[PDB]
Design a protein around this ligand. Structure first.
Ligand SMILES: CCc1cc2ccc1CCOC(=O)Nc1ccc(S(=O)(=O)C(C)C)c(c1)CN(C)C(=O)[C@@H]2Nc1cccc(C(N)=O)c1
Ligand SMILES: [Ca+2]
Lengths: 251, 55
């Protein structure tokens, strides 16, 4: 996160840290006790599928304070329409091997209903984006969880307000600033774009891509989660399958 | 009704045959008798921050 602040401990309780061989991989969002939503592009370079760990209740990477909960990722579910190395359909659904225990530091984010997300949440201007990604373009990553408030743009304004450029599809949305001061970065990939509505927070976006970290004339691109509610809900009701990676039909 | 101001609902809104509207809540919440408000039924409802809720 570029130009944000340290999220006070326990204030982003749905933030997931994804690890591969103990190394920082991506972020994610806890949506109940066994399910995490992240970005499909996070798993493009994975070979060691059995070494994927999800950490809940994490805040400071240099210290263990006892609030962290680690779980093996039993399954990674990606849409059939997602193509590795590209931008579209950038969402992954992760099944944890064992449920996390809900505490003051570990709480799911509400996965909203599609209608509510499209007709109400899409019109809330500001939302929170978070992660332990880079603090600057070509800089070091954060030791403490960072948070940034970003404004959402109508896809027409994203196109006219921006300076080999990939398209913005109906499965994406722009959020952020064009002045190069505030942004989500590659190390924040998979993390939540969370929207507040009448005292409750909801999952509206996933940290997906951009044209360089906090680049002038460019906005952050987030997966449009409202397009996947039904796909996500159907999969959460399905029986686990042998193998870690599962490609599931989309729609 | 749902398209405008969320049909007055705090959370989910369903339109019915006529100008009938039912508000609904996410799991871990129950609808109050006002028919619009949602109250938690569990210790850790989704989308709520315990350290802020206990302040
Ligand atoms: C949607 C995919 C994407 C992702 C991004 C850039 C371009 C593209 C489209 C082209 O496809 C790829 O490059 N795929 C790809 C696959 C694996 C990895 S990875 O490193 O293996 C993984 C573990 C994150 C990376 C990329 C690393 N990487 C550059 C990124 O993750 C980067 N993410 C990002 C997120 C938020 C803001 C900004 C921003 N403001 O620039 C950048
Ligand atoms: Ca820690």
């Amino acid at each position: 996160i570029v130009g944000g602040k340290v999220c006070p401990k326990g204030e982003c309780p749905w933030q997931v840290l994804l690890l591969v061989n103990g190394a920082q991989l991506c972020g994610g969002t806890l949506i109940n006790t066994i399910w995490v939503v992240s970005a499909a592009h996070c798993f493009d370079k994975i070979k060691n599928w059995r070494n994927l760990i999800a950490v809940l209740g994490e805040h400071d990477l240099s210290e263990h304070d006892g609030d962290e909960q680690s779980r093996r990722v039993a399954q990674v579910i990606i849409p059939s329409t997602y193509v590795p190395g590209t931008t579209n359909h950038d969402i992954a659904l992760l099944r944890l091997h064992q449920p996390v225990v809900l505490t003051d530091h570990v709480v799911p984010l509400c996965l909203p209903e599609r209608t509510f997300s499209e007709r109400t949440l899409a019109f809330v201007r500001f939302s929170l984006v978070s992660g332990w990604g880079q603090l600057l373009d070509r800089g070091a990553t954060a030791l403490e969880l960072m948070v940034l408030n970003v404004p959402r743009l109508m896809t027409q304004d994203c196109l006219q307000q921006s300076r080999d450029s990939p398209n913005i599809t109906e499965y994406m949305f722009c959020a952020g600033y064009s002045d190069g001061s505030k942004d989500s970065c590659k190390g924040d990939s998979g993390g939540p774009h969370a929207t507040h509505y009448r005292g409750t927070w909801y999952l509206t976006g996933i940290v997906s891509w951009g044209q360089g970290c906090a680049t002038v004339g460019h906005f952050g691109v987030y997966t449009r989660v409202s397009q996947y509610i039904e796909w996500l809900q159907k999969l959460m009701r399905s029986e686990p399958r042998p193998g870690v990676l599962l490609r599931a039909p989309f729609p | 009704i749902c398209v405008n101001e969320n049909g007055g609902c705090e959370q989910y809104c369903s339109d019915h045959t006529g100008t009938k509207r039912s508000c609904r809540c996410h799991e871990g919440y129950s609808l109050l008798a006002d028919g619009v408000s949602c109250t938690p039924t569990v210790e850790y409802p989704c989308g709520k921050i315990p350290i802020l809720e206990k302040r």
